[PDB]
């Protein structure tokens, strides 16, 4: 009873044809699924397995292993906040506070509208620009509440 939209099915198929073996495309497909729905829907896993020619069990264990994928909370925009040594030293707490002031949510939570979810992550490889956060694929240095608010206004 579960079928991928055609515009998504095509993209998945592109990834599967890209490497010499189909199963190498698994994480790219999953990224694409999450990109499309705002999360990994559990019911998407069965047919992804078929296309990969993998057991469902293999696929489920992969989703659970890799921290970027999320099977619980649908969100349009994921605010990834680095909570590692350098960002913590240079003001992660000030960033989290500003996010709470603007949006009304803490790490782990989703805004009532389903728009924004704050995800605490380990070092994002931009430590010299600490404290660092991402908004989906975009990545920024936090300067101040007013600066953060302007940035967030660009995601509608």
């Amino acid at each position: 009873e579960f079928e991928f939209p055609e515009e998504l099915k095509t993209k998945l198929q592109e990834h599967i044809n890209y490497f010499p073996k189909k199963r190498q495309a698994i994480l790219l497909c999953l990224h694409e699924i999450q990109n499309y729905y705002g999360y990994i829907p559990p019911e998407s896993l069965k047919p992804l397995a078929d296309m990969l020619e993998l057991p469902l069990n293999h696929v489920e264990g992969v989703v659970a292993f890799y921290d970027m994928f999320d099977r619980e909370d649908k969100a349009k925009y994921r605010i990834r906040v680095c909570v590692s040594i350098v960002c913590h030293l240079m003001g992660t707490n000030k960033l989290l506070k500003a996010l709470e002031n603007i949006l009304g949510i803490k790490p782990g939570e989703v805004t009532p509208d389903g728009k924004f979810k704050i995800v605490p992550v380990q070092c994002l490889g931009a430590c010299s620009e600490a404290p660092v956060f991402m908004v989906n694929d975009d990545e920024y240095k936090f300067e101040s509440e007013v600066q953060l608010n302007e940035i967030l206004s660009r995601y509608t």
Binding site: I85, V86, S128, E129, E139, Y140
Partner: protein, 416 residues
């Protein structure tokens, strides 16, 4: 049109790896070609594979992934094994403090690509992979585009420049696991599985991707290869000291005025990195410690060490995280404990329970809720993460924290 990227400061005294990547923007193939790009490749293809290995060997080039393994020698091991063989560029860069590889990927992709083609050719690999972390989406798209540019200019595909050598470079993305930067877990991930390290030996060069001889090298390592061919190994070895020659990248962060990536020779001292290059400390406060990523902790008494791979040297990835006099070392240790907690893959029991317990008990200590047993327990688990470990995460997960216990006893005693 790529995703937004912070503009990391970059500076070079050598003008090699950062010749273009010192400018915070994508340099497309035309600019690369104008600077003499891809001429090293052309010279490489008119040499034998064996000759290229000799040059890389004689260059003294070591790995920039953190272990400093001689690159020539790695290649030589691979080619004594029957083909087919695979080449892998490791762009997982997920060590705390470490952001040196990304500026090459994002700013000068063709330097990396050129390196991959020459190295693949040197070891007889017709298929190569870049494995880039999922949290670098911009680097991913930038690499995809750059590979297309190279194809169109005939630097990739079949029969490259009439040489008879075939190569495709595939770009894979990670999805959140630090352990996937471990070379055998990376391979497992490339095979479409969970990132569980494999018992070594065998090393990848004997048995790697699909069980075939596989060379894994770090981004920075690979980016050196065009220079070695262009200058020749003799001229390259004139840079820095003759035992640890050539450029090295140093990502500096924390309490420095000019945080960013510095291209420097390896006779540079740690004190020079912080004070001569990175502008000294914020507020001219005294240096308390330097964290070499999540690997080592250096005190203020250890700043006059060379940034080389000697026994007494800084070593590692060159990651310099500076803490000053007001920074609480126990707080910083907690952050390091939390990192390992989040990244153990759990295959090995002392690493699984040890990484969790070190972080859990240290949190209690930090918060002033630790019993006498919690204290004694923390000490014990710190010393007992490594037994039975099959990869380097379990081997080092206690290491830095142990060093803070030895080097800053007064601060730890405050918490007890």
């Amino acid at each position: 049109s790529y995703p937004a990227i912070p503009r990391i400061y970059a500076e070079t005294t050598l003008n090699m790896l950062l010749k273009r990547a010192k400018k915070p923007r994508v340099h497309s193939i035309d600019e690369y070609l104008k600077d003499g790009g891809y001429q090293a490749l052309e010279k490489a293809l008119n040499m034998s594979p064996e000759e290229i290995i000799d040059w890389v060997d004689k260059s003294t080039l070591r790995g920039g992934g953190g272990a400093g393994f001689p690159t020539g020698k790695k290649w030589k091991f691979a080619v004594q094994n029957p083909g087919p063989r695979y080449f892998i560029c490791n762009a997982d860069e997920s060590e705390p403090g470490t952001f040196k590889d990304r500026i090459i990927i994002e700013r000068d992709p063709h330097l990396l690509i050129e390196g991959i083609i020459i190295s693949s050719y040197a070891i007889g690999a017709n298929e190569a992979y870049i494995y880039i972390r999922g949290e670098y989406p911009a680097g991913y798209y930038i690499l995809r585009d750059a590979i297309e540019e190279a194809k169109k200019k005939g630097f990739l595909g079949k029969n490259i420049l009439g040489s008879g050598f075939d190569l495709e470079i595939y770009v894979a993305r990670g999805a959140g696991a630090y352990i996937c930067g471990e070379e055998t877990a990376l391979i497992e991930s490339l095979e479409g599985k969970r990132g569980h390290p494999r018992l070594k030996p065998p090393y990848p060069v004997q048995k790697g991707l699909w069980g075939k001889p596989t060379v894994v090298n770090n981004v920075e390592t690979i980016a050196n290869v065009p220079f070695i061919i262009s200058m020749g190994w003799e001229e390259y070895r004139y840079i820095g000291p003759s035992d640890y020659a050539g450029p090295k990248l140093f990502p500096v962060s924390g309490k420095v005025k000019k945080p960013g990536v510095y291209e420097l020779p390896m006779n540079t001292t740690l004190r020079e990195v912080i004070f001569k290059y990175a502008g000294g400390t914020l507020g001219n406060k005294k240096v308390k410690a330097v964290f070499s990523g999540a690997l080592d902790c250096f005190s203020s008494e250890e700043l006059d060490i060379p940034m080389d791979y000697s026994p007494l040297g800084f070593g590692g990835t060159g990651t310099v995280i500076v803490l000053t006099e007001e920074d609480d070392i126990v707080e910083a240790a907690l952050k390091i404990a939390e990192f390992y907690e989040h990244e153990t893959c759990g295959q090995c029991t002392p690493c699984r329970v040890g990484c969790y317990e070190q972080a859990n008990l240290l949190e209690k200590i930090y918060k002033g809720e630790a019993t006498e047993q919690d204290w004694e327990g923390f000490d014990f688990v710190n010393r007992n993460i490594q037994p039975t470990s099959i990869c380097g995460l379990g081997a080092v997960a206690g290491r830095l924290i142990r060093q803070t216990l030895e080097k800053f006893p007064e601060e730890w005693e405050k918490y007890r």
